[model samples]
Target chain A: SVLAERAGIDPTAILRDFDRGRTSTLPDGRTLREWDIVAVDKDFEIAPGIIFKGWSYNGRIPGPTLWAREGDALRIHFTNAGAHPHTIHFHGVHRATMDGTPGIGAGSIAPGQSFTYEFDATPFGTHLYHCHQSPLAPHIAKGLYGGFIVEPKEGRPPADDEMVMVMNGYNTDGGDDNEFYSVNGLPFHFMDFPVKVKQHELVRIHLINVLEYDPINSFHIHGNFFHYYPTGTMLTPSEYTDTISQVQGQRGILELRFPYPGKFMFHAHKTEFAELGWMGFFEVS
Target chain B: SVLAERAGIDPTAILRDFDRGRTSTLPDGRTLREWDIVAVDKDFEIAPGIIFKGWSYNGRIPGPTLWAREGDALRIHFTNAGAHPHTIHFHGVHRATMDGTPGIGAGSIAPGQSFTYEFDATPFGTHLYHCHQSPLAPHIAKGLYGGFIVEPKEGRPPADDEMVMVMNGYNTDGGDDNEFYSVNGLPFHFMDFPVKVKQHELVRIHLINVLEYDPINSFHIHGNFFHYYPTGTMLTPSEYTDTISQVQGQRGILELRFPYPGKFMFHAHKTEFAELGWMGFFEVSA
Candidate 1:
C-alpha cells in the first residue's frame, strides 16, 4: 500500500479493438529447448493517448504480454542480462518451487548467466512477475525488475474489446544513466506508444505490478466505473466496483463496462509518479 | 591515482605547540568510553562545508579520531545509534581478528547492540578506520569513515604541531541523495582554519580514506613539499617529494617542513576532489 489513490476512471471505455495498422510485428519468433535457448534483453514504451516513452525490457518497459496459452508448458530461459540480479515470482501459481527468489535456492541469473524457468500454463488468470531480491528496498530503488502474466485457461466473458495495463514506478531525472521511475520503465521523455480507445467498448484490463520495490498502484477511471475480479483470481468470487487499488506484487482483473465511451484515462493513485513522465492512455470508440 | 596534487600550505599549522600550550595543564586523560552518535536519515546540512548530512558517528562525518600511543592495548566499544547495521575496520592495525567485517566473523553490529573491540596498537604509524559492508560503494560513499594515528613508542618527532586530513569522493549534483565527491567529510568546500607557525617549524600530518569506493588519492601541499610515508609503515628520513597516493584500503603519513610560510593551500592530487571543496591553509611567521 505504498501508493495511494486520488481519482477514478471508467474501465469499460479503456479497452479497444486493435487494428492491423496498430500491431507490432516482431521480426523473430520461435520455440526452443530449455538450455539451448538464448535470452534477449530489450526495452519498450507504455503510454496512453499521446505516445509516452519509458525504460523497459527488450527495448520496451513492461514489454509485450508474451501471450501464453493454457495447458502448454512455456519455458522462458531468462538471462540476467541487466546490471543487477532478479527473479520472476508468479503471484497466482500455487507451487512454491516455481517462486523465483534467490534466498530460496532460486539463485540469481547473473549478468551473463541464464536461468530458464519452465511451468505448465494450467490455471487461467492474469498473473504478475517481479524482482524479489534481498534488502529489496534499495534493489527496487534501482530498476532491476518487471511483470509478466499467464493468460487464463478459459477466457472470461468476451468483451467488446480488451487491453492489458501493467502498473509500475519511475525516477524523473530524464533518461540519464541513473534516472528512476515506473510505468513500464521509460522516464519522462522516452518514446512510448499511445493508448487510443474507440468511443464505447468493454475494456478488460489485466493490471499487474512488475514493481519489485514497494509498488502499490491505485487504478482510477475518470468518468466511468467497472467490475473487478476482486483480486484478479478466477477462483475467487468477482466484485463490482468503481476503482481498483492493487497492492505491490499483486494483480487484478478489471472490466470497464462504460455507459458511453470517449477517451477514458486509467492511471496510478499517486499521479506524480506517472505525472513526472510515467503515464500512458487509450481512447474508446 | 584518481586525485592529483597542487602546491599548497602546510595543513598542520593549525595545531597549537604542545610545548607552549595546554599540554602542561591537561593531565593524562582516562580512556574515553562511549560516544554520543547521530543518524541523519533525512535531508539536512552537516556543517558549513558539507551540503548534505548523513548518519555521522559522532555527529560528524569521518567521525572523531582515537589518538592512542603505540604499544598500548586499546578497547573501543561502538553502538549503532542509527537505524542500520555498522562496523569498524582499522586500516593498518595488527588485530585483524576484530576487523568488524560482516560474514567474515568480524560480525554485524545491529542497531542498539554494542560490541567492544580490543586490540594492541602495535604499529607506530598513521592508520584509518571505516565501515565494511555490502553495497559498500554507497555507505562509505555517504561518509562513515575517518582517520586516526598511533604515535611511535618514543612519541612523535620534534614536530611543533600535528593535523589530520582525510581524502574522499562526492556526488556534486546538489545532493542527489546517493552520490558525492568529497574529502575529510566535506564536499566541494575546503575549510580555512587560523593558525601560526614560525620558520623551520615541523608539522606532522596523518591522512586516510573515510571512503571505501575510491582508491587513488594524491596528498599534495600547495606551497611546501613534505616527506611522504605510505600507510602500514613508519615515516622514513629519506627525503622524497610531497604527494602520497594511497590506493583503496590504505593510508598515508606525511611530515611537512615548511620551506617558506604565508597563507597557502594544501589539497589532494585528484585536484577536483580536493580543490573543489577540500582546500585548507597554513601560515608561517613569528
Candidate 2:
C-alpha cells in the first residue's frame, strides 16, 4: 500500500513482491514490473582479507543484475539506508523526472529517505546503473555499480549457457594505481572454480568493466573468436573477433561457441590486469 | 636501373628512386613502389650513456614508415647486414611463399644474404612489418619493426599536419620487464619539443604500440575527442573517442582537431607509461 501510494499507482495494480524475470499481470490484463533497490554504506571485502569501506546497492559487491523486458513499464523503489547522499543513475533512456541524478528530480536521497523511480524500458540492450554523486571516480571505484539488461521483446538467440561479468579494480592503498582486479567481486575467484560448459554449446556473456581509474579494459579469449554485439542492440554481430575492448561504462554482449571439448582461458589482455586478478577459464567437456 | 634489375622489370620501365608517399609509373601504365630496407646490428642510446647493443633496421630504433597506395605493387629489396638471421614479416594478406617467416621460400636472410619481397597492397590500413627471427620477443624489443601504411586509393581526409608514433618500451638491463618507454623512440622527446600545429587544424596520427612483453598500450588526448579509424580500414569512423587502446600488434589511425588555441597534451592513459615516458603535446596556437 505504501509503494502503491509512492508510485501513484492503484493499490490493486501493485504486486506485493517482484522477482527478476517475472512479470505481474495487472487487473486489466496488462503487465507491470517492479524492483526494490536500496543503497547502503558498508564495509565489504574486495578479496580475501582485503576489506574496503565502500558504497553499494543491496550490500552486494557488484550489487545485482536488474533484468527487464523491452517496453515494460518499470518501477524502482529506491531507499537510501547509507550514510551519504546517493542516487541510482542508469545508462538508459528515462524521463527527466526519473533520471535519479543528484540535482534532478528524485535527487540524491539522504540517509533514511526513500524515492521511487518509474519509467518505461525501451531499446533493449545491456546497460549499467551507478551512483552519480560527485567525486564519481572514488565512488564508482569503491563499488556502486551493477548491470541492467533489458531483453528484446521478441527474445534473443538461444544460448546453452550465459554469464554476467563485471570487471572491476581496487586502489585500496590510497594510491592512484589499481593494486587488485576482479570479475564478479572476488579476485582470482573464478581461477579456483572454473566455469563449466558442454562442447558445441553457445555461450552468452554480458560483460561490463567498471574500473574507475583506467580508461579501458579488454576481453580476450585464448583459442576461439566470438561474435560481438555492441550494446546488444543488433541481432547480427558487428564483428567476429577473439578480442574486444571497452572503456569504463561501455558494455556489450558476447556470443561464442566451442567446437571441441577442452579448457579455454579468458581474461583481460592487459597483462597487468590479468596478472593482478582479472582472469578465469571455461572447462568445456 | 638497378631497382629494375632487382625487381626483374625492364630498365626502360624504371623510374627514379621512390621514397615514402611518392610513386612511379611503369611503362605499362601500372604503379610500382620500391623501398630499400636493411637490417643492421647496431648500438643505440637508451638515455644519455645507457647504450643498447641490439638489432635494428636502417640503424634507427624503429626503422622508418614505409608508405604506399592501395593496389600498388610493393617491391622491398631487403639486405641483411647484421650478425644473425632476420626476415621482414608484414602484418597483411600475402601468399605463403611471400611471407617473411623462416623455413619458407623467402626464408630468413643470413648475415650476408638479401631477399626481395614483392606483393600488392590490399585492404588498405595502418599495418606493421617486423623481423621474424628466432627469439622473437627480444628481436622486436631491440627494435626491428617499423610502420607500414597502405593509403586508400580515394585518399584520406586532409589534415594540416600528420605524424607517425610508435609506442615502445626498452629493457636495457636484459631483464624481462621494461624499464623505459617512449614515443617515436625517444623518452619525453615531444615534451622537450612539442608537436606544433595551428588551432583548428586537423592532425592525422598513425599510431602503433610495439612494446614487446607488454600486452597493451593506449593513447589519450587531452581536452578533445578524435575520430578513430580502427585499423585505418574504415571509410567512416567506427567511433568518436578521446582514448584508444591497442594490443602489441594492433595499429590504428586517429584524426584530431583542436577547436581553441592552447597546448593540449597527449599520452598513454596508463599512468606509469606516461610518467616514465610515452607522453607528448600538441602545441596549438591561434
Candidate 3:
C-alpha cells in the first residue's frame, strides 16, 4: 500500500454472518445455527511492514463474527489447532456446561482436540467471544477474539448500510504496552481507501473493542453525529453525539446519516492512537 | 514527593473560584465579580524529576478558573508580563471589543501590558478560557488555560462533595504527540494522596479537557456510575455511565454517589494514559 505494506479487509463484507453457517429447523420449530471454528497460530501483517505473531480463530486475526437472531439455538464446534490450550468464552447468557473454561464447563480445548458448545442467543445486543484461557491478558492480546451479534426477533428498523467495526491493537515489542492499533485488521487501512457510502443513507455500525493490553478506546466522527445504542439491547438510543467510548471488552451500536456529500474522518478520539493507526474516513457520494 | 521533583497543586482547592474574586453590588441590583490575572513564564515541575519550561497566568500552570453566575457582571483585568504576547479568550458571549484575539477585539497584549474585559456570564455551562495567540498549540501545551464555570441563575442542588477535574496532557518532547496525561495538574497526584470522601455522599465534579497535542481524554471509575451533564449547560444528564470521554476542547459535569464504602480507583480509561500517570484513587470512608 510507499503506503509499502498493506481486504486491504472488505469492510462491506463484515455485516452479517447468518449466511455463513449451517441451519436446521428443530422439532419445536425453532431455528438452530451450527458453526465451525478452529484456533490457529499465524503471523499477521497488522500494518505496513508490521507482522504480529498472533493466535486467532479460523486463520483470521479477529476470527469471524458469529450471528443469530434472538432465541435462535447455536451449536459451535471449536477445535484448537494452535500450539497452546484455548477456550471460547462468550460474553452472553449461557449454561454452565458451555462456559468453555476448566471445571463445570467445556474446559480448555487442547491442540488437536475439539469441543461442542450449545447455547441459545437471548436478549439480543452487540456481543463478543474470546479465549478465556488462564493468564487471560496474553491469550486476548494474542488476538483470539471475534464479534458476536444477536438480532432482535421483533426486528425494529432497517438501514441502507450496516458494518462491523472491531477496534484492536497489536503489541509487537513484547512489552505490556500495545504499539499498533487498527480497525478490521491492518493499521491505516481505511485511510488509504476511505469507506464508500451514499449520501442521505442511514448507516448502522456495530462497534466493538477487542483491544487487549488497554483499558479503553473511543470513536469519534468529524462533521457528523450518530445515535448511540449502548450495548444495542435497547431499541431507543442513549445519546446522539459525535463521539462514544467503550471499555476493552464492551461494545455498542451506532446509527447515523450523512446529510452532506463529502469525505468524513472517523477515528479513535485519542490523538496518539489516531495518529498511530486507528483512523479512517467515509467517502460519501 | 525520592519522588524528587514536585501543593503538588492542591486538588481540594479546585472546587470554588467564586471565593477568590472581589465582589460588589451593581446598580441594576445584580452581583458583579472582578478579578486580576497576570501572564507569566516559568518552569513547572509536572512530575517527579520532570521540569517543564512553561507559560501560565498568575504564575500557576492552569490559569485559575474564573467563575460567575448566569447574569452576574464580570470585569477581568488581564496583565501580560510574559516575555511573549498573550490574550484571554473566554468561551462565552461578549461584545466584539471584548474578544481577546487580534482583529476587531482586544488584540494580543504586548509584554508588560494589560487590558480589561467586560462581559455578562450567560449560558451557564462547564467552559474554559485560554490564550488565543498564534500557533495556538504551543500556548496551550505550555499551560495557559483554566476551567470556567457559570452557575444557573437559580442555583443547583447542593452537592456533598464538589470537585473540578481538568483533564490535561504534556508534550514533553516538543512533538505533535503527548507523553504524559493528568487530571487537575500533576499526574498520579491523587494516587499518591487519594482524594478522600465520605461514603454515600453525592459528588459533583466539573470535568474539563484542556489537553493539548492529544485530541481526547477520558475518566473511568472502577465500581461506580455517574450522571454526566455534557458541557454542564443543561441541568439534566445525557447519560448515567461509569466512563465518559471528552474532546480536547469539550467539557461536562459528573454527579455521582458512592453507594458503598472502600477505596475506589479512577483513571483515564486509556491504558497507556493510565499507566503514564493519569490515574488516582478515591478513599471512601465508612
Candidate 4:
C-alpha cells in the first residue's frame, strides 16, 4: 500500500549463502565436500520489535541451505554447543550407522561433543535436515531445520534467480497454535521489503515447510502459475499451478517468471496464516 | 480389530449411480444427455445413529456422479423444492449464462421453479457441481453438491476397480471449525465396513474435496504409492507418492495397487480430522 521500504533486514540475504560445499579433490578426480556445523541457542527478532527465543544450527533460525552434487562424498562435522542433546537427521537414502538418530552409533551428540557424519549424497533432489532429538515437535518448533539440495548430475534448466523459502511459524506463547507464520524467518518482512525481481527473468524458488503443530501449509502466488517439481527429485515438473501444498517435513522446487511488471502477492492460502503475517509481495520490473 | 462387519451401510453404494445420463439422439445423430435434478430438504443418517438435516440433489448427499463423453451436449433440468433458491453451478468451461451463478439467466431458481442448463462438455476432466447461492459455504456444507466427469474422447486405460471418494465434513455447531470429517458423506463408516478390493488389482479412485471450513485436506495411504493425475485433465500422472493434497473444490484421480493381501489404513494427513472420524481402511484380498 505504501512505498516505504525497510533496509534493516534483507530477506534475500539467506539465499546468498554459499550453497556449494567446501570441496577437496579426490585421488581419481572424484568429489568430496566437508562442512562444519555447530548447534547453539539464539534469540531471533521474528518481526519488527518481536523477539523469539529459539534454537538453531550455526546460530541462525534456519541454519543453512546445504548443497552437494549428486554422488559426492560428504562429511559434516557437527558439534553441539547448545544445552540439550541434538542430532542432524538428513532426509534421503543413508545407512543406519550415519542416520543421526538417538540410540544409534554416533547418532546423538551431547553438549560440547562432536560427530563427523560421513556419507555419499546420492539420489539427488530437494531434501531436508533437522534435529531428530527426543521431544521431536518442540525441537523442530523451536527452530532446528533447513533445506538440503542435491543437484542432479545432469543439472537443470538455467534460471535467472534461484532462492530458498523455508515456510515456518512462531508459537511464542508456547501454545498449541501458532501466533505468527513466515518465510525465511520473519513476519510481514516482504511486505516492507518486497522481493525484487525482473519482469521476464525466470525465478526458481526452493520452498520447504518446517511448520510444527500445523498439519499442512500452502503457497499461492497471485496472477501467475509455476512449474512445481515435487521433492525436486525428478528432472521434470509435476504440475503447473498457482497454488501448491506442503506438509511439515516436505519440500519442493517452483520455477516461474513474471510476465508483467508491478507488485504481486504471495502467501499461504490459509486465511489464518496469511492474515497472521505469512503474506508477501514481489516487486517486478 | 474384530471381523464383525456391519451390513447396514454399503460404503460403495454411492458410486453405483447412473453416472451416464439419459441419451437422446440429435437429428444429426450426435450425442445429447438429459438429467432431471431435484433439490429438496432431507434428513440423512451420516453415521450410525447420527442424523443430519441437510439439502440434496436427487435425494443424496453427493447428488450423483454425472458423466459425459467430451464434446457432447449436456442438458440438466434442475428444480428447487427447498426453502431457499438453488442452481446447479458447475466447475468447467461453458457459456456465461449457463454458469448458474446468481443474477445470471435462469441461474437462481426459487422454490418450485425449474431451469434447464444446457452446455457442451468440453476440455474433459474431473469436474464438480454445487449450488451457486449467496452464503456459499453453508450452501455447499449442507449438501447440494456432487462430482461431474468429462471423459476424454480418445478414452483412458481401463482399470480393475473404479470408484469415487468425495471428502467432506460436518459442522453441527455452525462454528468456524468442522466437528466430523468424512469421505463419501460418513465418518468412520469404512472402519465398520472397509473398501473391498483385490490384491494386485489396479484401483482407480476419483478423490474430490468439498470440505467447506478447512482450506486444505490431504489423503495418505498406509503402505503404497499411486500415480496421481492432477485434475484428471492429463492422461499421464504428475507424481507417484503415498500422500497427495487437494483443496476445497479441487479433485484428482489416483491409481494404485496392493501387492499383498491385507487391511491397510487410509486417512487424512491432518491428525485432528483423522481423530474426528476421517480415518478408514482398505481391505485387500488375493
Candidate 5:
C-alpha cells in the first residue's frame, strides 16, 4: 500500500493499460511495463539536402523513449528484424541472463528472431538502450539506440512540458570527424520548427548523448540557468548552471522555468558541433 | 607560522637557492619560487625514426615538471623564444592578472619577448600548464605544456617511488586521428626503459592526459587496482578501481602497491592508443 502511495499510483490501476504492449501485469499484481523494439537498416533524411544511410530501432534513428515508474517490472520484447545479429543492451542493473551480451544467456538474436528482456527497474533514473553487436562502432553509428527514463516513485514537481533529447553524430565517410550532429535525428530541425512552450512554464528535459567515435559533448542554454540532476537518480538537483558537460553514455535531467516570454538558443558548447548542426531553440510565448 | 608548519616547509630556508634562479624571496621574508620557461622550436624523436619537428618548452615535449609547496608564492618567467607568440596558461586558480590567457591581462607574449606570472599556490592538487596561443591545437600539439604539482599543506602519504605521467598525442600531418601517442614525450619509451620499482612498494602516479583532438582517454593497470584521488584535492580517496577515465585537462593521483615482483603493464584503455605507443610497463623487483 505504501509502495502504491509513494508511486502516486495504485498497482492495480497501473495494469489497466496492460495487454496493449504498453504495460505488463506481474504475478504479484504489480505492473511490468513492456516495450517492443525492432532493429532495421534504412535511409533517412537528416536535413533538406543530407540523408543518413544507417541502422535504427523501429524505423527511427533513436527508436522511442521508454518510460516507467520506479520499482516496476519492465519487459522489452526485442526483435532483430534487421540485416545482422543484434541484442538490446540496456545500461542498468539486471541479472546475467538478461545482460544482452553476445554468447551470454539471451545472447544476440538472429534476423527475424525475437528475445524477451525482463528486469525490475531499481535505483530509477535516466538511462539508455542500444544494440550491442560485434563491430559495435558501425552498429551503433548506424543508429539502434533510444532513451530510457525511470520515474521516481515519489514523482517530481509539476512541469508544463517534458522532453527527451538524444545527441548523436554521424560519420558517413568512415572517418574521425563526424559529418552531421543532431538533437533527435535531424540537423537544425528545431530551428525551423522550434519547440513550443508557454510563458513562465517549467520544462523538464531528459538529455542523453550517444555520440560515438568522439569522447565528450556539452550543452549550454542562453540567457537562463537550470537545475541539473546528474543521472536523474536523486530527488534533489546536483547543481544549477547554464552549461553541463557529458561524455559518451552519460545522461541527465535538466529543469528550467521561463520567467517571461521570449526565444532562447540551446546547443552544444563545442562550437564545431554547434556550427555543424547540434543546435536548437525554444519559442516561449 | 601555522602556514609554514602546515606546509612542513621553512619560509626562510626555502630561499636557499634564492639567487640561483630557482627560488625567489620577498622583502617580507616569504619565499617566492621562480621557474624560467622558454619556448623553442626543435626536432624531437618520438621513436627512433618518428621525429616530430615542432615547438617545445625548454627543448622538450611536455616541458618540465614544476613543483612547489602549498601557500607559497610562485612566479613563472615565460619567454616566447619560438617562431610564434605564446603564453603559459595554467589549469588552476589564480588572480585574473596572472591567468596567462591571450590578450586578457599580461596576454600573449610575442616572439623574442617575455612576461612574468605570479600567484599564491593554494587549494593544492595535480594541475597542468600549457601554451594559450591562438590555434591552440597546433601550439599544444607542438609541445608547449608540462605538469604542475602543488604539495598539500598537510602533506601526503609516502611512496617508495613517485612519477609524473603525461599522456599526449601528436599529429605530424595535421590529420584527425593523431599519428602517435606518448607518455612523458616519447612513444613506447617505457617499453625499453621500464619504470623500475621494488616489491610491496607503494607507488604514487600523477597521471594527466593532454591528447588535444580527442575528448577523453582512460587509464588501466594490469593485475592491480588503485585508490583514485580525483584531482588530488581531497584528503581521502573517492573510489577504488582498476580503470579510471579522464577527459581533457583532467588529472589525478593513483596510489598502488605490488604484492609480488613481476612486470605489470599500464596504458590507456582505448586499444588504439595503447597499440599506437601509449602503453608502458612497471618492472618490480625483490
Candidate 6:
C-alpha cells in the first residue's frame, strides 16, 4: 500500500512532463517514465465479511486515488492485467495524447501489455476514469472503470484520516450475470466487515456513477445533505451541496459534514436493493 | 377532465397561407390553428392528503397520459400559458420540428405564443413530453412533464382502468440544488400514497429516465420480473424476466402478472429511496 500510494502519478502532471519532453528510467531500467495503471482481476471484501470478484487496479477497484493540486505534471505506469482490452478515458479534462481513444490516439492496452499516459492537470472539476474502448455499453457494464479527483490549489480540508470509497452497482443475478453492487469493490454483508469512524469527524466520500442499465441514480445520505463538489474537478473551490447526483462515468466529491453523529444509512435512491440487502451504514462516534 | 382525452392535430400536413408558395386555409379561414394547454403552479395531492406544488403540463401533476399510435402524424397546438418558456422534448422518437431542443430547430415558444409540431410517429415505444427551456433543471424539477405512449401494433392487454405513474424527485426546500428521488414528480411516500393495481390483471408500467445527473437507474420489481421491452425501438415477444436496468434515455416496458391478489412493490435497486419513503405499492386484485 505504501509503495502504491507514492508511485501513483497525478494524471495532470504527466501531461506537463510530455510537453517538456522529459523522461526517467523505469525501475526495470529498460522503459521510460510515463503514466501507468495496472488492471488485474481480484477479490475485495467491501463490507466487513463479504468477498466479491472485481476488476481491480494495482489490487484496488478504483486504482489509487492520485490526489494532486493544479499545474502538477503527470506520469503513469499502466499495466493491463485484465482478461480484455482496456483503456481509461478521463472525462472532460483534456490531454491530446492521453485521450485514450483506441485506433485514434495511443490506442488500447491489451491484456499483459503495459503503457504509459502522461498529461497535465489543466482545469479542475470532478472528472471520471473509465474504459474508453469499443462495445462501450458492456465494457462499462462489466466494471472496467473508477473515479478520479483533482484538487485545487487551496487543497481539501484535513479529515481525521482520509480514505477513498467508490460506490458502484452491477447486474449479477447472484449467479447468472456476475455483476453486483460493490463499494470499494466489496458487497455490504461481507463477514466480519468493518467501516470504523468517530462521531463528528469528517469523512470524504468519493462517489462514482457506473450503473450499467439504470439512468438517474438516487444517492442519499440519511442524516444530512452531505457537502458535494460538482463533477470531482478540484481546480475550483467545490461548491458545497448536500445531495449530489453523478451520471454515467461522472465523479463527485462528497465532504461528509455529519452534524449529529451516529450510524447513518447510505444506499441507492430507487429503493429496489433494499430487498437484496444493498444497504450499509457509516459508524460515527 | 372531460377534455383531457380530446384528440390532437397533425400540423405538418396543412399548407401555410402566410409562407411563400402556399395557399391553404382551414374551414374557419384561419391560416394557423390555436391549441390550448392548461398550466398552473399547483401542488399534487400525492398521499391522498399531502400535497406538493408540481410543475405539471396540464392542471394535474404528471400532466395527462397522452396516448397515440405509430405512423399516425399528430400535431400539438402547444399553448404556453405558463410564466416560463415551456417546450416539450419527445424522448425515444425522432421528429422533424419542435422536438424540444431549445434553439435547435424551432425558436423558443414564448408565453402565449403557440407552435404547431407535426411529425409521423415512425418510432414505436414509450416516450416523454416534458419542458425544455432555460433553468431546465428547476423547471423540470418543478414538474411540467408527463408520460406519452405510442400504442403498439396490437395495443396493450385489457385493463379495467389504467393508471400512469412517473417516478421523479423534487427539491421541496426549493434549494437551488436538485434532489435525486421522486415518483409522479413528487418525493415517494410509501404510507400515504401507493399505486393501485389489480392482481393477475395485465398492467403496463412505462419508465422514462428524466434525471440528467444520475445516469444509471436499476428499476427492480419485487416478487417478479415481467417482460422487458426497450423503448424508441420495436420489441419482439420475449420470455419474462424480473428486473430491468436502463441507461439514460433508454425506456423499458414491464408488465405485472400479479400472482396473488395483493399489493406489489416496484422501486429502483438503490434502496436508500425507501428509507426516505420513495417506495410505492401497486395494489392488485384477482
> Lowest summed-lDDT stretch of 10 residues in model 1 chain A?
A1-10
lDDT (Cα, tens digit) per residue for candidate 3, span A148-167:
88899998599888788889
Worst 10-residue lDDT window for candidate 2 chain B reads B9-18
lDDT of each prediction vs. the true structure? 0.50, 0.74, 0.78, 0.80, 0.74, 0.53
Task: State residue B275's C-alpha deviation in candidate 5, in Å.
Answer: 3.5
Docking class of 5: incorrect
Complex DockQ, candidate 1: 0.01
Deviation (Å) of A113 in candidate 2: 1.7
Q: Report each candidate's C-alpha RMSD, comma-separated, in the order given.
A: 22.6, 12.1, 9.1, 8.5, 11.7, 19.7
Position B250, candidate 4: lDDT: 65
Question: Residues A1-285, candidate 2, lDDT per residue (tens digit)?
Answer: 112222221212111111364479868665688888888877755555666677878776687787888888878888988888888888889899788777777677788999888877777988878888777777688778888888899999777887677888878896787888877776666665666778778888888878878777888664455678888877877755556788898899999777645555567756567668787666678
At residue A119, candidate 6 shows an lDDT of: 67
In Å, residue B18's CA in model 2 sits off its true spot by 19
Q: Over 4 Å off in model 3, which ranges?
A: A1-12, A15-20, B1-165, B169-206, B210-227, B231-235, B238-250, B254-286
Q: What lDDT score goes with residue A96 in model 2?
A: 91
Each model's iRMS: 29.9, 7.5, 8.3, 6.9, 9.1, 18.4
lDDT of 5 by residue, A1-285 (tens): 122233221212221111224765778988878877888777776655456687877777676777888888888888888889998888888998898899999688889999999897777898888888898887787888888888888888876787888888888675676887878777676665667778668898888889987778878664455778999998877655455679889999999876545556667755457666787677778
Q: Please compute DockQ, using alpha carbons, for every candidate against the native two-chain complex.
A: 0.01, 0.05, 0.06, 0.06, 0.06, 0.03
Prediction 4 global C-alpha lDDT: 0.80
Candidate 5 achieves a global lDDT of: 0.74
What's the true lDDT of residue A121 in model 4? 82
True contacts kept of each: 0.00, 0.04, 0.07, 0.05, 0.02, 0.02
Please give, for residues A10-58, the per-residue lDDT of candidate 6 as tens digits. Answer: 2222211112223455555432323456787765543333344556566
**B1-286 per-residue lDDT for model 5 (tens digits):** 1122332212122211112137767888777888888888887656555567878777766777788778778888888888889888776555444666564566788999998888777557777788867565677778887788778876897777777888888887777568888777666766755677888888888887777776677899889889987767666786799999766666788998888788889889999988987887878898
TM-score of 5: 0.58
Give the TM-score, chain B only, in order for the candidates.
Answer: 0.76, 0.90, 0.95, 0.94, 0.90, 0.73
A198-272 per-residue lDDT for model 1 (tens digits)? 454676766666543333445544434455674455644344333344556667677755444333334443333
- Candidate 2 residue A59 C-alpha distance from true site, Å: 2.3
